[PDB]
């Protein structure tokens, strides 16, 4: 039975009936499981037998997982939709799957600026550089903002590069003297930071206990809506700094030990039909890799530069590397001193 497609994906990360539509156009029935963390999936692929034709791991893992011959290169000849992929994002993805050979971007997010336009304006004055990493990385700026509170993700592997990229170094630099600079910067601002956390800020941004939060885009939208919701006159805006930013994509790949290869490819191609990816996003509401899909996406999500960026910004976007041990704990030690 070659109407058997073994798929593996994030939970609630799909259309109401994407799989149907597929089947209806393939005559391939799909078995749809859903994992909840990269660790559980990564544990499958390594277990000598995936048993799946398609997984959608996070690009940070895809990278490593690529290096361990876990996937087969795509046979692009059988993916006539590939043209619909956003060339810009694909390019900013080469430093993860070189020559875009293995996966395509499903949906993605960024580490950017979550903020409250009103509180920022009253704490800062006119013209808060709310589109620029300047907002938080100039002492005389963040200090004014302490008065309404500002948060950073507790996560050095991601946050540091914000500093690095801000200082002009390469975001993935391995250099002791540079990482230090990054450290000396965060130290000039540390006294002006309420707290470091990867979750508290979501509600504090929504209740307006704090006015500036640097964190994940998905997280900031949660707050934004949670906020409109709470009918308490709190506004949550989100920006991707003109200087570009950190970014992450969930990638659809095909494992090397795939049983139904030729079906899986058909499947990936299916996912790039403008109106299908358009649909997936109307529902879960994270941007996707599909350029020619956009104009189909719901006016409200389509027109929100907080999700669909200048694409001059698109070009200034970066991924996160596979860091080497020395750096890795170099950062931890850094972060540790930074907090206290």
From Swiss-Prot:
Disulfide bonds: 148-211
Keyword Acyltransferase: no
Residues given in the record as putrescine binding sites: 11-12, 219, 250
UniProtKB keywords: Disulfide bond, Periplasm, Signal, Transport
Top-level taxon: Bacteria
GO cellular component, one term: periplasmic space
GO molecular function: putrescine binding
InterPro entries tied to this protein: SBP (IPR006059), Sperm_putr-bd (IPR001188)
Deletion consequences: No change in type 3 secretion system (T3SS) induction.
SUPFAM superfamilies, per the entry: Periplasmic binding protein-like II
Cellular compartment(s): Periplasm
Single biological process term from Gene Ontology: polyamine transport
PANTHER family recorded: NORSPERMIDINE SENSOR, SPERMIDINE/PUTRESCINE-BINDING PERIPLASMIC PROTEIN
Function: Putrescine-binding protein probably required for putrescine uptake into cells. Binds putrescine with high affinity (KD=3 nM), spermidine with relatively low affinity (KD=6.8 uM). Does not bind cadaverine or spermine. Putrescine binding induces large inter-domain conformational changes.
Family membership: Belongs to the bacterial solute-binding protein PotD/PotF family.
Protein name: Putrescine-binding periplasmic protein SpuD
Species per Swiss-Prot/TrEMBL record: Pseudomonas aeruginosa (strain ATCC 15692 / DSM 22644 / CIP 104116 / JCM 14847 / LMG 12228 / 1C / PRS 101 / PAO1)
Encoding gene, per UniProt annotation: spuD
């Amino acid at each position: 039975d070659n109407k058997v497609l073994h798929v593996y994906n994030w939970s609630d990360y799909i259309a109401p009936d994407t799989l149907e539509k597929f089947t209806k156009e393939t005559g391939i029935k799909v078995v749809y499981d859903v994992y909840d963390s990269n660790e559980v999936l990564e544990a499958k692929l390594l277990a000598g037998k995936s048993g799946y034709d398609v997984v959608v791991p996070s690009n940070s893992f895809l990278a490593k997982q690529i290096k361990a011959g876990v996937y087969q290169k795509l046979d692009k000849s059988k993916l006539p939709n590939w043209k619909n992929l956003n060339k810009d994002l694909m390019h900013t993805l080469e430093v993860s799957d070189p020559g875009n050979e293995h996966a395509i971007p499903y949906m993605w997010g960024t580490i950017g600026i979550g903020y409250n336009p009103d509180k920022v304006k009253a704490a800062f004055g006119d013209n808060a550089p709310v589109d620029s990493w300047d907002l938080v990385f100039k002492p005389e700026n963040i200090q004014k903002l302490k008065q309404c509170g500002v948060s950073f993700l507790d996560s050095p592997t991601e946050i540091l590069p914000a500093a690095l990229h801000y200082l002009g170094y390469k975001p993935d630099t391995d250099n002791p003297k540079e990482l230090k600079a990054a450290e000396e910067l965060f130290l000039k601002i540390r006294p002006y930071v309420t707290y470091f956390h990867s979750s508290k800020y979501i509600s504090d941004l929504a209740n307006g206990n704090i006015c500036v939060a640097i964190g994940y885009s998905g997280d900031i939208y949660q707050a934004k809506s949670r906020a409109e919701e709470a009918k308490n006159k709190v506004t949550v805006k989100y920006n991707i700094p003109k200087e570009g930013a950190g970014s992450f994509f969930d990638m659809v790949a095909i494992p090397k030990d795939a049983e139904n290869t030729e079906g899986a490819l058909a499947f990936v191609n299916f996912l790039m039909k403008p109106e299908i990816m358009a649909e997936i996003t109307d529902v879960v509401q994270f941007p996707n890799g599909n350029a020619a899909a956009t104009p189909l996406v719901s006016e409200a999500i389509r027109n929100d530069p907080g999700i669909y960026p200048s694409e001059e910004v698109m070009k200034k976007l970066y991924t996160f590397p596979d860091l080497p041990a020395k750096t890795q704990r170099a950062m931890t030690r850094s972060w540790t001193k930074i907090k206290s």
